[PDB]
Write a protein that binds this DNA or RNA. Structure first.
Ligand SMILES: Nc1ccn([C@@H]2O[C@H](COP(=O)(O)OP(=O)(O)OP(=O)(O)O)[C@@H](O)C2(F)F)c(=O)n1
Ligand SMILES: [Mg+2]
Ligand SMILES: [Mg+2]
Ligand code: NA
Ligand code: NA
Ligand code: NA
Ligand code: NA
Length: 312
DNA sequence: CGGCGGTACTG
DNA sequence: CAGTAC
DNA sequence: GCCG
């Protein structure tokens, strides 16, 4: 806390206005300022911290000394509105800035005047719902609904809830279901059947991303709702992967996002490349053998981590 | 200087 | 493609 | 913004 509470509003201001690299820098400086054993008190001290350069140091000496940070006085008043628009699924910083330039200030303005993509229209229709977390118990019910429908046309299908669910969180922003088949081939063409089964029973309410004319579809992003009173619309993400990519896909879909980024960053320093598909060597490199998550960790020179230890 | 993760849709 | 998303 |  302290200096960090002021750096954070700045970091978010930069993020929502699209300065993602500078926001990134603020993020990492804030982390470093979160785990330093002591209240920094000197320019020299701050600078000695990995993640904190001269500039960020300049701004720390200004905080606990004058109590203020003049930079916060220069945050565009547009920022709260950019964040409002930005929270619409399918609208990012470019779209929000454009709406704002065109004079849009409220979701009512958006509803009545903006031209919305199909995704943004669904995003708007479920604005509040997409901003809530569900109890992990609800994520379980949702994943089982998907699994039960999948196992209907092929009981061999492996279905696994990933993301914050697999990391053990008490609540989940949505449900991430990884689907594969141990025989290494029966995963092909399952999306059509699965999705239609799920539509058939009124489980799926909206589709956000779903290239079903592509026999090579990898992902489904959309919306579902369990039956009964007091149910909310929930975001559901499904990926279907070849068994050969199981460990990398599992690792990717388990996150956290910051964890994946860090791990891929490490692979690169070691002459590798890590994706949801595989871990390979840096033109056509070599695909490395990764039958299990542990294999990816080992090859990177790391101690294995339980999903819950990946909650970065 | 130049990377900051690597990849899949949509229009 | 630029934009957005996982 | 920060890093090598
Ligand atoms: N920029 C991103 C976003 C996601 N993911 C990977 O895609 C997975 C799912 O994305 P999610 O469902 O949106 O984020 P969650 O962790 O489950 O937190 P919540 O419950 O609020 O959703 C991530 O775990 C991932 F593992 F993090 C990623 O690799 N890079
Ligand atoms: Mg999730
Ligand atoms: Mg998700
Ligand atoms: Na430093
Ligand atoms: Na959005
Ligand atoms: Na479609
Ligand atoms: Na609802």
């Amino acid at each position: 806390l302290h200096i960090t509470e002021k750096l954070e509003v700045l970091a978010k201001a930069y993020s929502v206005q699209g300065d993602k690299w500078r926001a990134l820098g603020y993020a990492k400086a804030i982390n470093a300022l979160k785990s330093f054993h002591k209240p920094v008190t000197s320019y020299q001290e701050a600078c000695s911290i990995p993640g904190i350069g001269k500039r960020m140091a300049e701004k720390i000496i200004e905080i606990l000394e004058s109590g203020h940070l003049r930079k916060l006085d220069h945050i565009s008043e547009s920022v709260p509105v950019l964040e409002l628009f930005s929270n619409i699924w399918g609208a990012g910083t470019k779209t929000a800035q454009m709406w704002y330039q065109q004079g849009f200030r409220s979701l009512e303005d958006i509803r009545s005047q903006a031209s919305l993509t199909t995704q943004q229209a669904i995003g708007l229709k479920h604005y509040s719902d997409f901003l809530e977390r569900m109890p992990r118990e609800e994520a379980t019910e949702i994943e089982q609904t998907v699994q039960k429908a999948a196992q209907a046309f092929n009981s061999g299908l492996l279905c696994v809830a990933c993301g914050s669910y697999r990391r053990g969180k008490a609540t989940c922003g949505d449900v991430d279901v990884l689907i594969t088949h141990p025989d290494g081939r029966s995963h092909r063409g399952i999306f059509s059947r699965l999705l239609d089964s799920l539509r058939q029973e009124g489980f799926l309410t909206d589709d956000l991303v779903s290239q079903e004319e592509n026999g090579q579809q990898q992902k489904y992003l959309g919306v579902c709702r369990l039956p009964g009173p007091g149910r909310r619309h929930r975001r559901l993400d499904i990926i279907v992967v070849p068994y050969s990519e199981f460990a990398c896909a599992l690792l990717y879909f388990t996150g956290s996002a910051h964890f994946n980024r860090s791990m891929r960053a490490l692979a690169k320093t070691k002459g590798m490349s890590l994706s949801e598909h595989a871990l390979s060597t840096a033109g056509p490199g070599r695909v490395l053998p990764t039958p299990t998550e542990k294999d990816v960790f080992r090859l990177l020179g790391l101690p294995y981590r339980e999903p819950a230890e990946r909650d970065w």
